[PDB]
């Protein structure tokens, strides 16, 4: 059942409570509910997405940025970055799977294998993840010639059709620059290669969000309770520091209600809101909690530390012919290439967007167009590390999000981004793109030196919208990892975290499907 008025829920005790109906949370809640003897509550601050066209129709996604569907988290002033940048985060069932571009990737095996081998996360490797990617998806590429693929899972992945002529020409241009066409999600990492994406979208244009995929089919299940429009303000603990449930409100100034869990509570509020909720509940860096008058239940210094992202630059071009006016999601191609020899993962990625992306260039006076395209390089393994911290002890105050972009001491992130702008220019300049590439609008051909491109990047960079890593898993004995390898919050019992917070190291690719995989694995670790 769907509860949209908490005042009518009389029995508020469940076996499991999942907090946050996002990419991971929806998956955890649905998988736990597959046992009819187990009762599960899924609590989400935003509305139900059922029948909401702006959310459901993927090609409308860019309209959700800074809408009522967006928590809208501006960042703290950046030491070496864009202080105007905003971390858009969805406030709606499905979480960011309901506001995103649906770019769908399996993580490289080399990334996942390292979670265990390098970062102490016992049991987290490609052997554990491959069957879960299979289980979660219905992939267009499924079949005996690609037996790793799922053909039955809730999350539908399809290939973006090569309809966009500028896209086709860009791929031809990649080939000329020595970047071959490569299939994505084959099980083998693409180090040097490019193509139209796979996207998690259904045939009819509906995003295959975690809510559409996992939740809509089960809303009437007898053992499943969906609670929307309800915002968690604190986790509640014993006595013996067992998490017994969660305090929620239906409106900022209203009565506090509580839901209780007999077995466990799973926190899935994502990489920004998770560390915030833990800190408000007394789990976090002791000095920071004390500063805000919060009783320290667990001194957990890794909470809100190790914030990682894929920082993003932009190169914008006027197009010499009419650009496409229809799309799956306006960002249909990805390009991977290594900037150095010896790599088993690309250190650089670029997206191609069939629109001019002027979000951060217009304010700095760069020219605009209504007929143009963008190439957006990102750093796949940024070395910079930031924080999420409390602004105050009041749950209604937005957290302080400081990614510390381009602050890594060896200057890796900036070096790769500069290479990325140069590589974007190189691809755009190939013969196959001669009939497309017009004037470069930003940074503009006048920007040529390392220094000029660095200044431009600092002023105008965005994000691919991939904050991760703020409540990382790690070795039981590592004090700076708030979670053990089974996602259990250290220092407390009955509480796990499952969402993008958990990643010890960012993945090379767009993380959404991997975060769904994290939810699948959390369900399994529990059951």
Ligand X SMILES: *Cc1cc2c(cc1C)N[C@]1(*)C(=O)NC(=O)N[C@@H]1N2C[C@H](O)[C@H](O)[C@H](O)COP(=O)(O)OP(=O)(O)OC[C@H]1O[C@@H](n2cnc3c(N)ncnc32)[C@H](O)[C@@H]1O
Kindly list the catalytic residues: 466
Task: Kindly list the residues in this chain that would bind ligand X in the complex (CB under 6 A).
Answer: 19-25, 43-46, 88-91, 95-97, 99-103, 231-232, 268-271, 273, 277, 464-466, 499-500, 510-512, 515
Q: Are strands 298-299 and 283-284 parallel, antiparallel or unpaired?
A: parallel
Spatial separation of the C-alpha atoms in residues 61 and 45, rounded to whole Å: 20
Q: Give the up-direction half-sphere exposure of residue 447: CA atoms within 13 A in the CB hemisphere.
A: 19
Collapsing DSSP states into helix, strand and coil, what is residue 181? strand
User: Could you tell me the end-to-end alpha-carbon distance of the chain, in angstroms, rounded to an integer?
Assistant: 23
Spatial separation of the C-alpha atoms in residues 508 and 506, rounded to whole Å: 7
Spatial separation of the C-alpha atoms in residues 147 and 136, rounded to whole Å: 14
Element (H, E) at 495: strand 495-497
Q: Give the up-direction half-sphere exposure of residue 223: CA atoms within 13 A in the CB hemisphere.
A: 14
Tokens of 183: 């299939």
Name the residue nearer to ligand X (CB basis): 48 or 440.
48
Question: How many CB atoms are closer than 10 A to CB 322?
Answer: 9
Tokens of 374: 């963008």
Torsion, CA 509, CA 197, CA 498, CA 301, rounded to 10: 20
Spatial separation of the C-alpha atoms in residues 462 and 519, rounded to whole Å: 27
In order, the DSSP letters of 188-235 are: S--SSEEEEPEE-B-TTSBB--HIIIIIGGGTT-TTEEEE-S-EEEEE
Closest residue by Cα to residue 316 from 350, 351, 356: 356
Nearest 5 degrees, angle CA 28-CA 34-CA 39? 80
């Amino acid at each position: 059942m769907h509860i949209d008025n908490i005042e009518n829920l009389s029995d508020r005790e469940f076996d499991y409570i999942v907090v946050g109906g996002g990419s991971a949370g929806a998956a955890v809640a649905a998988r736990l509910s597959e046992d009819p003897a187990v009762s599960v509550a899924l609590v989400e601050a935003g509305p139900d997405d059922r029948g909401v066209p702006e959310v459901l129709q993927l090609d409308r996604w860019m309209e959700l940025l800074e809408s009522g569907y967006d928590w809208d988290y501006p960042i703290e002033p950046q030491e070496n970055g864009n202080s105007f940048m905003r971390h858009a985060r969805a406030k709606v069932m499905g979480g960011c799977s309901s506001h995103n571009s649906c770019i769908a990737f399996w993580a490289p095996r080399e990334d996942l294998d390292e979670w265990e081998a390098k970062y102490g996360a016992t049991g987290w490797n490609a052997e554990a993840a491959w069957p879960l990617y299979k289980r979660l998806e219905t992939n267009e590429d499924a079949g005996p010639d690609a037996p790793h693929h799922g053909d039955s899972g809730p999350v539908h992945l399809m290939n973006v059709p090569p309809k966009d002529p500028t896209g086709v020409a860009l791929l031809d241009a990649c080939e000329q620059a020595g970047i071959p066409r490569a299939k994505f999600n084959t099980g083998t990492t693409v180090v040097n290669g490019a193509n139209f994406f796979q996207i998690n979208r259904r045939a009819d244009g509906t995003r295959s969000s975690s809510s559409v995929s996992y939740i809509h089919p089960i809303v009437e299940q007898e053992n499943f309770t969906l609670l929307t429009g309800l915002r968690a303000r604190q986790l509640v603990f014993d006595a013996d520091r067992r998490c017994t449930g969660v305090d929620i409100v239906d409106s900022a100034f209203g009565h506090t209600h509580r839901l209780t869990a007999r077995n466990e509570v799973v926190l899935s509020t994502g990489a920004i809101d998770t560390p915030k909720l833990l800190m408000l509940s007394g789990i976090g860096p002791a000095a920071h909690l004390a500063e805000h008058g919060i009783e320290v239940l667990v001194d957990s210094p890794g909470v809100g530390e190790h914030l990682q992202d894929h920082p993003e630059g932009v190169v914008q071009f006027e197009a010499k012919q009419p650009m496409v006016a229809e799309s799956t999601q306006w960002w249909e191609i990805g390009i991977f290439t290594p900037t150095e020899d010896g790599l088993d993962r690309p250190d650089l990625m670029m997206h191609y967007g069939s629109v001019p992306f002027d979000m951060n260039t217009l304010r700095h006076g760069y020219p605009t167009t209504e007929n143009g395209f963008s190439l957006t390089p990102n750093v796949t393994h940024a070395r910079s590390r930031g924080t999420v911290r409390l602004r105050s002890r009041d749950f209604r105050d937005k957290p302080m999000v400081d990614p510390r972009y381009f602050t890594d001491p060896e200057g890796h992130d900036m070096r790769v981004m500069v290479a990325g702008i140069r590589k974007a220019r190189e691809i755009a300049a190939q013969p196959a793109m001669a009939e497309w590439t017009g004037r470069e609008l930003s940074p503009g051909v006048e920007a040529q030196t390392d220094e000029e491109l660095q200044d431009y990047i600092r002023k105008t960079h965005n994000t691919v919208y991939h904050p991760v890593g703020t409540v990382r898993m790690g070795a039981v004995e590592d004090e700076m990892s708030p979670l053990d390898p089974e996602l259990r919050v250290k220092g407390v019992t009955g509480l796990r975290v499952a969402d993008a917070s958990v990643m010890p190291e960012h993945v090379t690719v767009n993380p959404n499907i991997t975060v769904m995989m994290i939810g699948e694995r959390c369900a399994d670790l529990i059951r």
